[PDB]
Write a protein that holds these residues in place. Structure first.
Motif: not given
Lengths: 248, 248
Positions: A59, A62-63, A66
């Motif tokens: 994650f 993933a951050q 983004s």
């Protein structure tokens, strides 16, 4: 002034004095739009840490995606990394997006030998400026705590050879290929000083010619924040500096 | 000005335009020391949401405790709650610590019928001001979308009866026991407007006599933030407002 976007990759502090909370306030106070990737959550306090909540390295990645796939990042500050997979994920994205002006604070008072190992090999070659104190520098170099000035200067130079573009050894001495440069606290509310200084160095770097100048302005600003720390009313323990001393 | 500490209980936005990132910037820009409890993490973007990472309600509670057991909170803004256990945990701490000036934004475009149910029963009786738009108000009341002004006014009054000290129905009409009060956008970069307005209302409430005055100053400030949104350079999608338009 030209628009600068600053990113912080770090842990949190609910009490708002350290972590991405401090990084973001510092960015804001110094004229930079702030972005933030969270590496770990922590129930933190002005009286200390109550507990840590880990986030899946995936994650964090993933951050990172983004942000880098959408926002142009001009400067970056790195704090708590927590574990090997996080370090790897960060180093990998830093390399992929050719991230510049990377200021790496050394949050390791902790990291496993594996995480530290990964940091020196995968991350160090990507940082523009690292900001460790004596204990942290020795740990990064797996060497004895510097006893004298010479040993301290040797470690600073060793860290450069490891890939760091510059080193700010906190006793403060700034190391660059060029050479070295030398650089008080009257308050007990120093919570988040380390996070704040590294965030300040990151936010100010793009507005200066060299690290020497940005280090100089960053410290002046920090002293002013500490000099107003007592006017705040937060916590029963060690309070934070006042990031917005210049505004209110 | 007296020192005010503001807390935000919400989700995150790595791109820094919404979530606690926006709440914290708004607090900062309006003269309030910011604290933040994270209810959920999200890999978010100026182009939309990539993924959501949930946090254990227990850690949200732990975060709430780290803050309330150490920092005096003068105002609070609530955003993303995500699930029933989070709503319950928040309501419970709000009650225990007699938290005042609670501004509840209505992030539910989503919440399970169970979560919404818990919100109206356990949380509503604790909020000073709720700020829903028409679709959200109907959902909170489990009623049809307001067709006319009268129906809209009826819903505002219904929400007061439910426990809310005041209601700001966004079309804007402010509802109080006293009565009602009535209250443009020329930019496409409106990302985080909702989070920002509720954060602004929370930060400004302590500096005013009534909600009418704080609602008036909050909107004026927000319009100014939106009027500078285009001068920022973040994202390829819908940009955020400029929280620090008054400073840089």
């Amino acid at each position: 002034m030209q628009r600068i976007n600053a990113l912080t990759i770090a842990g949190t502090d609910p009490s708002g004095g350290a972590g991405i909370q401090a990084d973001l306030k510092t960015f804001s106070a110094l004229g930079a739009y702030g972005c933030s990737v969270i590496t770990a959550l922590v129930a933190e306090n002005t009286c200390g840490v109550q507990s840590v909540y880990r986030i899946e390295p995936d994650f964090v990645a993933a951050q990172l995606d983004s942000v880098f796939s959408d926002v142009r990042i001009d400067t970056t500050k790195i704090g708590m990394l927590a574990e090997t997979d996080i370090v790897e994920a960060v180093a990998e994205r830093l390399q992929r997006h050719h991230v510049r002006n990377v200021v790496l604070d050394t949050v390791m008072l902790l990291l496993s030998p594996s995480a530290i190992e990964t940091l020196r090999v995968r991350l160090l070659p990507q940082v523009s400026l690292i900001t460790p104190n004596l204990p942290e520098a020795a740990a990064l170099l797996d060497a004895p705590h510097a006893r004298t000035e010479q040993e301290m200067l040797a470690q600073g130079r060793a860290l450069l050879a490891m890939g760091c573009e510059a080193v700010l050894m906190k006793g403060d001495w700034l190391f660059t290929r060029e050479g070295e440069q030398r650089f008080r606290v009257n308050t007990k509310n120093t919570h988040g000083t380390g996070c704040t200084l590294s965030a300040a160095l990151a936010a100010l770097r793009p507005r200066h010619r060299s690290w020497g100048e940005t280090v100089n302005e960053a410290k002046a600003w920090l002293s002013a924040a500490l000099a107003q720390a007592d006017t705040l009313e937060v916590g029963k323990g060690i309070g934070p500096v006042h990031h917005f001393h210049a505004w209110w």
